[model samples]
Target: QLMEGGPAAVHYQPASPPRDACVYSSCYSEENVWKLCEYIKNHDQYPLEECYAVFISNERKMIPIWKQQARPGDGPVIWDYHVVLLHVSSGGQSFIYDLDTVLPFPCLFDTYVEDAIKSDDDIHPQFRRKFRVICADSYLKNFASDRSHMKDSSGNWREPPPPYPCIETGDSKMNLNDFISMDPKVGWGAVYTLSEFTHRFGS
Candidate 1:
């Protein structure tokens, strides 16, 4: 069944001073990848051996002044980030499930990487485009969050929290602006890489 053992819908809720907003982009990416992995493993009958959760970090030349304050031509370039799931079939076929891109979901891995490189002409030569792949099972078992604040004063919340997940149903067709603007309810924290994730949490 679709509702089976899988990663928990760990909501992203950061502490005060900056507050937390249930931004769908972060929530969707975090939730969907786990959902898809479980779906593939349970429904599609794909062995857990092939599924993976991928974290993508894009080096950007122009860092927008969204989360933090910015001025004209600030130095120290920033990196635009995103996450997705990867599945490699037994026959050596690789597929990418990126929910926040114009590209097709479950697309060829090579094609996704090529398009990503072309999209940002300003990307760094060395780190223009890269992916950190980790086992889906590892992610589901270890992924944790601090969403205690997500509950209301009485310990309950409502639906459709501001800027809902890109696609409520059907295939996802998310806008870049919407994705970027939908900042993490809690800051992305230090989960920047697969190693970082494992280090912070556990195996």
Candidate 2:
């Protein structure tokens, strides 16, 4: 019933990663989230206005350290990182689309946030998690990474290669620890908020 009207209406179904789609990669979250937003705009016929690329993080948890010199030790750890897309309807309803989860349909934003807090106690509590919402167009233009293989008309790699499509990339191979250790260059523009993100962004 959720997948009927605006972007927020899309029902969440456990979606299988498309063939050859990048399911696991350092930038998997960014790549897939961008692609899903494109699909909603191009295929589902939803306007770009309803789609967003959201970054969620905890300010209390400092970034972890890791590199060639000092590798990380194994143990129970709580990663202070994650990313997801949010679709908001004109009516002010919102839904979260997370590819990493097993839910069969899009979950209401409130429900997702509630479960997220209860799912892990060590990480920042729900109240500590901050949200930053960027329009899909800005994300595509500024945040999407450049690809290695894109070519120019002269048969050479484009001077600045084109951005990789979400479906064309490889799966994410990094574990949670690896992801946590990564730099926040991916979605660095996110905003921290204690209230409903939709209400803050709603026109």
Candidate 3:
């Protein structure tokens, strides 16, 4: 069943903050939203130091904010604000600011705040931060295998229980973790989850 948003598309592209962002979809208070905009500008990692903020919908819905800086000399420099809106079929839409454009990751503001409120140890072990990296579905399916055994009329094994074969063709067992560590470029997108990083700053 659809949880929310009725299967809407989340379009991500480069734009500026505040001004370029027209849609303001979210649960965050207005004060916090303003703080987030300010944080993006003052944060060390963000490329643009200044941006224009604008209200989109009648209630000032969220959208991409434009950057005032001149376009970069090479690759696209005028990145748009990242907006993530969640609309529940039963409930209304919740808009979020994904910091991926400014930073190198995807984030939802409330999730980040919640994660920050938790103790650091709960979110990360040994003070290490966490990131989310999604991989292709086909690559993950090979990890599981089906086991079948013949049964007699009495519903017991005919002779003895037979071992299930590995899904891989080779005699050696397939080490999934090894494959994940060996190749870095196989995945499409990798970003920090909202909570892990938020705790670092606010909590």
Candidate 4:
């Protein structure tokens, strides 16, 4: 298999952030990530700036991610887009929280990039992943989605959406596009290439 999961660092085990009761739905990682922020909020173990909601996608909407249970055999899938949370500590450790990944509740930053995200030069340009990094507190205050993107040509649900009401903020009823936009100048957060993101956030 191209990907594998190892025992998390002991201090990181038991999902210190507490994964229980975190809302998740099939193929709705954006919604799942929003819920993760809420759960982390209640915990309040880290400062506001240290935790972030990271959106991974490219203009082509195809980034190959490994260690995903959604795909069989080596656990790889080309997701149109994905969202995961990043938590960085003053102690100089960074972890990623991915609900749809098989890696771990919160995998080490380097491991997540190596297995789940892979590398930019190793893949085709169109499949290169770009990250939109937003502070979690800001995300909760601004992010919203109407679930319109899930509707098909016939107006049928592509898959069932989150049972809970769709997320919305007073600033915008639907700003999913802005959040997903990779243009650093245009989106809610700064956009970075794989290398750029690593340089900015990695240990």
TM-scores, all candidates, are 0.47, 0.53, 0.21, 0.89
User: Which residue pairs show backbone clashes in model 1?
Assistant: none
lDDT of each: 0.44, 0.49, 0.29, 0.82
Poorest 10 consecutive residues by lDDT, candidate 4? 6-15
Residue-wise C-alpha lDDT for candidate 3, range 74-161, written one tens digit per residue: 2222111222211111112123343223322233333433432233344223232233232212222322211122356777754343
- Model 1: lDDT of residue 38: 56
Worst 10 residues of 2 by lDDT: 63-72
Candidate 2 per-residue lDDT, tens place, 114-154, comes to: 54423233544543455667787665555533343245666
Measured with C-alpha atoms, the lDDT of residue 98 in candidate 3 is: 38
* lDDT score for residue 62 of model 1: 28
Task: Give each model's clash number.
Answer: 0, 20, 30, 0
Q: Summarize candidate 1's per-residue lDDT along 1-203 as a digit string, tens digits.
A: 47534233233121111112112233335555655665556654567767777655533422221111121232222445445776665544466666544455455555655553233345345444334455877655545433332357887742222343323323223223322222333222222332343333321
Between candidates 3 and 4, the lDDT winner: 4
Q: Quickly count the clashes in candidate 3.
A: 30
Ranked by lDDT, top first? 4, 2, 1, 3
Superposed Cα deviation of residue 150, candidate 4 (Å): 0.5
lDDT of 1 at 190: 24
